[PDB]
Copies of this chain bind each other. A is one copy, B any other.
Amino acid sequence: RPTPPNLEFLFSANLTKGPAYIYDQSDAQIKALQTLTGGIIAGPNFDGTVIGGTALSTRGADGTIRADAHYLIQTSDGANILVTESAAIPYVAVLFDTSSEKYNWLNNVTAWGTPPNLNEINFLEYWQIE
């Protein structure tokens, strides 16, 4: 029988965003670019801040929302880490890239996050899946 993967808490993120800029609107769908302006990252094995990035989203009247984002985390001790997100909002899949010797274990991680309280859409908790 299929055995599920384990889940281990990885980090929380409290992000700030500029207003979306809609560039392609039809009556049932809007596509936008949104600047990721900052935020704090906090987990057991790393922490830091978001220096910047961009999200591209497509939001349907049917309730679907697809988003793709790249942003960079700089850790407390100075490592730079690219975060690549792809999301069926509010569920977010995450990959990471860094050459930092202390953080390059993230290169092999698939993570997943969602806001624990949808009232507060920009506070997310993420989990390592494996």
Q: Which residues of A contact B (CB under 8 A)?
A: 1-5, 7, 9, 12, 18, 21-29, 31, 33, 35, 51-54, 56, 60-64, 66, 70-72, 74, 80-82, 84, 86-88, 91-93, 95-99, 104, 107-110, 112, 114, 116, 125, 127, 129-130
Cβ–Cβ contact B29 & A82, under 8 A: no
Cβ–Cβ contact B56 & A70, under 8 A: yes
Q: A57 → chain B, closest Cβ, in Å?
A: 11
Q: A36 → chain B, closest Cβ, in Å?
A: 9
Cβ–Cβ contact B26 & A62, under 8 A: yes
Given the interface contacts A18-B52, A86-B95, A95-B88, does A60 sit within 8 Å of B12 by beta carbon? no
Cβ–Cβ contact A3 & B130, under 8 A: no
Number of copies: 4
* Interface residue from B7, B51, B62, B130 paired with A21 (Cβ < 8 Å): B51
Which chain B positions have C-beta within 8 A of A70? 33, 54, 56
Given the interface contacts A2-B116, A93-B86, does A26 sit within 8 Å of B23 by beta carbon? no
